[PDB]
Amino acid sequence: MMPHTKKILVIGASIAGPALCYWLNHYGFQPTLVEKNQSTRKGGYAIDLRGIAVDVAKQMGIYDSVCAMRTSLQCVRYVDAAGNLLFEEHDEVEIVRGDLVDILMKTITDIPCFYDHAIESLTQHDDHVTVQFKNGKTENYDLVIAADGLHSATRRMVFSKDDYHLRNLGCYISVFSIPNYLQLDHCETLLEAKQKLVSITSDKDSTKAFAGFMFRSSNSPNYIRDEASQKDFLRENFTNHGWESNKLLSLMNDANDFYFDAIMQVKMKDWTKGRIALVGDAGYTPSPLSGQGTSLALVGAYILAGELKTATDHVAAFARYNELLKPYVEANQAFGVWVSESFLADEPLSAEQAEERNNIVLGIMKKATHAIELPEY
């Protein structure tokens, strides 16, 4: 529709970035994808597609592919500190994060994609943006859109401190790989007590398992960005917590995939400035406790590209983007806050108490998943 706007750079290859490139190309734009790392994220943890994000995936033609790769867990076991089994548990879809990225990348094979391109600077002009990569390459684009995640390097570069802040929800999450020493088979076992959750999961590969930790604490690691300090923080919180906690902490240094972070949300009044925009976690992260981050990344890419297809100019498009997505961002971020405060139990739940909570979580979560209708373009 609009002229002069065809050439668009998209920064980061995870969920929103590749999905955005698909739709921009579909609508006749000329997207280029760049990623700071040498490769896309491989493997990772399990994520969900819910509500209108499923419709996005169907309209993209990836829904069948996502089902083919979905998680296979046969049972979920809840145990007490002694390890006694309290109870078992044995359209939306769950898929390992890296598997969804892989599926998304395969839809854009015709799109230029450059890895190991870290960005040195972004200079806004009246009619374009000049990007200088750290490798020396300099190029002009009509628009630039940053998909590069919670910690986005582009956001801090483009937006002033007054435009955004990161809300810390007072919780922490950690995941690392372990041998499957319990020899679990397509099973996840959890201990939930004392505002803390410990989990062991083995699904597709019986020689592998994944430890996970989620807890609420007002303290912090002594150095938040330092892996060793993070591990020390986990030891302090989980030593003698019950079940396998101590064993998992001892395997922690053999992991080699370790992941740790505070639960955080990105809060902005406007996700766009001039000719630059943010999509996915870089703008609005709801956080892992919401479980809605992937859905919001997909819907965010869908609407931004559709408004750019519709509008007279990018300024009008960016305004509609902010307006239509805001209620969805707000509802999903409020769900993450509710989880951070109200979810974790003080002591293990019975089979009946777990059932009651699950129904409450589903009802509260529905307010987020159904918050808006998917626009048509």
Swiss-Prot record:
Chain positions recorded as FAD binding sites: 13-16, 35-37, 45-48, 97, 259, 281, 288-294
E.C. numbers: 1.14.13.-
GO molecular-function terms, A-Z: FAD binding; oxidoreductase activity
Catalytic activity: 7-chlorotetracycline + NADPH + O2 + H(+) = (1S,10S,10aS)-3-(CONH2)-9-Cl-1-(Me2N)-3,3a,4,10-(HO)4-10-Me-2,5-dioxo-1H,10aH,11H,11aH-cyclopenta[b]anthracen-6-olate + CO + NADP(+) + H2O; a tetracycline + NADPH + O2 + H(+) = a (1S,10aS)-3-(CONH2)-1-(Me2N)-3,3a,4,6-(HO)4-2,5-dioxo-1H,10aH,11H,11aH-cyclopenta[b]anthracene + CO + NADP(+) + H2O
Pfam families: FAD_binding_3
Reported cofactor(s): FAD
A biological process from GO: response to antibiotic
EC top class named in words: oxidoreductase
Regulation: Inhibited by anhydrotetracycline.
Assigned keywords, A-Z: Antibiotic resistance, FAD, Flavoprotein, NADP, Nucleotide-binding, Oxidoreductase
Bound cofactor: record note: Binds 1 FAD per subunit.
Domain of life: Bacteria
Record's function text: An FAD-requiring monooxygenase active on tetracycline antibiotic and some of its derivatives, which leads to their inactivation. Expression in E.coli confers high resistance to oxytetracycline, slightly less resistance to tetracycline, moderate resistance to minocycline but no resistance to tigecycline. Degrades tetracycline and oxytetracycline; the reaction requires NADPH. Degrades and confers resistance to chlortetracycline.
Protein family (similarity comment): Belongs to the aromatic-ring hydroxylase family.
Note in the entry: Isolated from an agricultural soil sample.
PANTHER family (alphabetical): MONOOXYGENASE (PTHR46865:SF2), OXIDOREDUCTASE-RELATED (PTHR46865)
Recorded domain comment: Consists of an N-terminal FAD-binding domain with a Rossman fold, a substrate-binding domain and a C-terminal helix that bridges the 2 domains close to the antibiotic-binding site. This last helix is flexible, is not found in TetX of Bacteroides species, and may contribute to their different substrate specificities.
Protein name, UniProt field: Flavin-dependent monooxygenase
Originating organism: Unknown prokaryotic organism
